[PDB]
Amino acid sequence: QNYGINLPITGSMDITSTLCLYYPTEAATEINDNSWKDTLSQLFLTKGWPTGSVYFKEYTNIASFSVDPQLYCDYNVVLMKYDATLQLDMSELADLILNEWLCNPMDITLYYYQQTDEANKWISMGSSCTIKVCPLNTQTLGIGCLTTDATTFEEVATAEKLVITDVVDGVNHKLDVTTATCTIRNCKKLGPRENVAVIQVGGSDILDITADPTTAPQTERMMRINWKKWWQVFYTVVDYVDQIIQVMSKRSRSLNSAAFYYRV
Amino acid sequence: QNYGINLPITGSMDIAYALTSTLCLYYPTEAATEINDNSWKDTLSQLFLTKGWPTGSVYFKEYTNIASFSVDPQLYCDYNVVLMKYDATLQLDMSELADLILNEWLCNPMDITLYYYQQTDEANKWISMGSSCTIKVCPLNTQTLGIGCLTTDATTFEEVATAEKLVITDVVDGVNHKLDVTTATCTIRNCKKLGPRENVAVIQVGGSDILDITADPTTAPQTERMMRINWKKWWQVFYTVVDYVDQIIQVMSKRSRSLNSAAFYYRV
Amino acid sequence: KSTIDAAKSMATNVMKKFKKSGLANSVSTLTDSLSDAASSISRGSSIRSIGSSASAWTDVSTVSSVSTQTSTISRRLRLKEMATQTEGM
Amino acid sequence: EYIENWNLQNRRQRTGFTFHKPNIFPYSASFTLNRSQPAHDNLMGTMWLNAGSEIQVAGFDYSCAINAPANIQQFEHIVPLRRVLTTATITLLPDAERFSFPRVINSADGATTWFFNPVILRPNNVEVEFLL
């Protein structure tokens, strides 16, 4: 009915949907089977999910899953393999997939950009991103780097499929990123995205979904278990699907309540 | 007095209300090899005497390896403190050992040659202990037939372990599972997690704390009985343990199943 | 009106879908609630109700609170015409 | 009023003394536990405070009725009076104003203490019986 306007909510103190899963190809190679999806679907049928409602999509690596990682599914659970060198990749992937991001694309050779507040970051994606930034002064004079110099810039990210870059707000900057293998969009964080839950196999709960140093909140949607065989992990996931679905709720934007409020 | 009947306990708040222990330790043999001394036990006994606990009743035992300690642990004592070495490659071993020694398990034998099995509660876990355990399982639907594996054969099963010294396993509730394990060396038991056990506390002598004590991935809490400190020399670890013995005794307590009054409650 | 060839299975076919819709589910739930109330001994007096001696007929489980209670009561009471307790049309 | 009461009592008729906030409830701050453990890891019982002219009770469960028969746990509390009362107006609120804070109180063993970490819900099926 009515949208676009918030109204006081009053009350008295006295008084079957799709679910997607993701996995590494290494798991499939370590299982060596092809009917396993059907078996897990039957187990979900036994556990209380109607057959013909659970989907499965396969990727090859965390980097491959990081380019255009849009999850369009009413209830998303993501399995992520813990590496030893991809801490930034995992952390920023979880940050992107856990927060509702509103993005504005940016031409890189026409304007000089800045940041408004502390809830603004720069999301970038592509085959390879080489982002360089030079903070100008208030009088359009370069400080330690020249506006027409393409070599003295402060390197911040190279050969990264997914990089989240934040700069010091309050002063303009010049950007020079190759718009043939990369694209950077001005994005603003609105709030928590609760339609995605991530189960981390291995590791020690290091993924920080906030770049702020003072705070480091461990949101409940980052589970942690230890693995030796993938069948064990799949059995644990299927057996205790009730707890995971109870952790999550309906997406805040799919319902006809965020319509005309940056819907979906 | 009356035993085995839960009865109301009267109390009050206007009445003014507010040793003989037996300590035991388990440590790996590399500590004993590194310390290069064998008279250190007398020093530890004297230091425990200085704090206040009597000597003579303190026992020490060694285990060759964490895998050797994993198979059939023995715990007959009053305050169990175990030092477990940390590694970045054997997380599941430490997790399963701490989980097994932290909670009481009421178990029954399992015969996987003439029966099927299924779960009925969230505390139903399957524990396998032996020298070479390789659990092979094929799920069966309500019609008692194999899905993704044929019941007639056994090699096509989806394994959950391979020659593991100890393996805790959970299966999907509401379905039958046909099992085939080499019973000549390893045993599988059906255990239910009745409740917590405070008689055993584990100190992770290492780095990144990774222990989980719950089978559900939703919650992985950090209990207070789980201690963790850094280490380079074992004498420093022993000094820290003996200095903070009062805190360890306060956080722990007597076993909640051998109080001489809690009879007919699955112990004593 | 069609008045067609030798006897068909019209009654059976209509019953097949008449026994699957919401009426059968509602009567099944009502019978289950009555059975559970008759078996309600392990909890003492526990069935939520507004009247006395909860009989699994005036429970409140689902403006004005009284309006919601009465609406729930009538929605469940519609099945009373399936119990031959009525006296009129 | 008192002289009239005395005279009518001496003549064996109906007596009556008026009061505002009558201090009739005896002071006995006692708590009762049913599902108990030596280390106080999961509890289920009742704690009440009946002082002055006010009665405050609070039923608590550590399991939050998670292993209970259909997620419903009952609590009964019976408080007798030494003398009868008539024509009573009662003020009743569904919130305990004293047993809703983190507290640590000595147990009934007389030598140990346990912690109380409360989270208040609204009570359900709140039945009160005035019986004679």
Coordinates of C-alpha atoms in Angstrom, one line a residue, chain C residues 24-86:
Chain C
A24 CA -9.6 -31.1 5.4
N25 CA -6.5 -29.5 6.8
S26 CA -8.6 -27.3 9.2
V27 CA -10.7 -30.2 10.5
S28 CA -7.5 -32.3 10.9
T29 CA -5.9 -29.5 12.9
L30 CA -9.1 -29.2 15.1
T31 CA -9.1 -32.9 15.8
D32 CA -5.4 -32.8 16.6
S33 CA -5.9 -29.9 19.0
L34 CA -8.8 -31.7 20.7
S35 CA -6.7 -34.9 21.0
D36 CA -3.7 -33.0 22.5
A37 CA -6.0 -31.2 25.0
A38 CA -7.4 -34.5 26.0
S39 CA -3.8 -35.7 26.4
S40 CA -2.7 -32.5 28.2
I41 CA -1.5 -33.9 31.5
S42 CA 2.3 -33.5 31.4
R43 CA 2.0 -29.7 31.6
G44 CA -1.0 -29.2 33.9
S45 CA -3.1 -26.2 33.0
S46 CA -1.1 -24.9 30.1
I47 CA -3.3 -24.4 27.0
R48 CA -3.7 -20.6 26.5
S49 CA -7.3 -19.6 26.7
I50 CA -9.6 -16.7 27.7
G51 CA -12.3 -18.9 29.3
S52 CA -12.0 -21.5 32.0
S53 CA -11.0 -25.2 31.6
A54 CA -9.4 -24.8 28.2
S55 CA -11.3 -27.1 25.8
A56 CA -9.3 -26.5 22.5
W57 CA -12.2 -24.4 21.2
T58 CA -11.6 -20.9 22.4
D59 CA -7.8 -20.7 22.2
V60 CA -6.2 -17.4 21.1
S61 CA -3.3 -18.0 18.7
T62 CA -4.3 -16.3 15.4
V63 CA -7.3 -2.5 16.5
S64 CA -8.7 -4.0 19.7
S65 CA -7.4 -7.1 21.4
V66 CA -11.0 -8.4 22.1
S67 CA -11.8 -7.9 18.4
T68 CA -8.8 -10.1 17.4
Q69 CA -9.8 -12.8 20.0
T70 CA -13.4 -12.8 18.7
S71 CA -12.2 -13.0 15.0
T72 CA -10.0 -16.0 15.8
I73 CA -12.9 -17.6 17.7
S74 CA -15.3 -17.2 14.8
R75 CA -12.7 -18.4 12.2
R76 CA -12.2 -21.6 14.2
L77 CA -16.0 -21.8 15.0
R78 CA -16.9 -22.0 11.3
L79 CA -16.2 -25.7 11.5
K80 CA -19.0 -26.0 14.1
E81 CA -21.4 -26.5 11.2
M82 CA -19.5 -29.7 10.5
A83 CA -20.3 -31.0 14.0
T84 CA -24.1 -31.0 14.0
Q85 CA -24.2 -28.7 17.0
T86 CA -26.2 -26.0 15.2

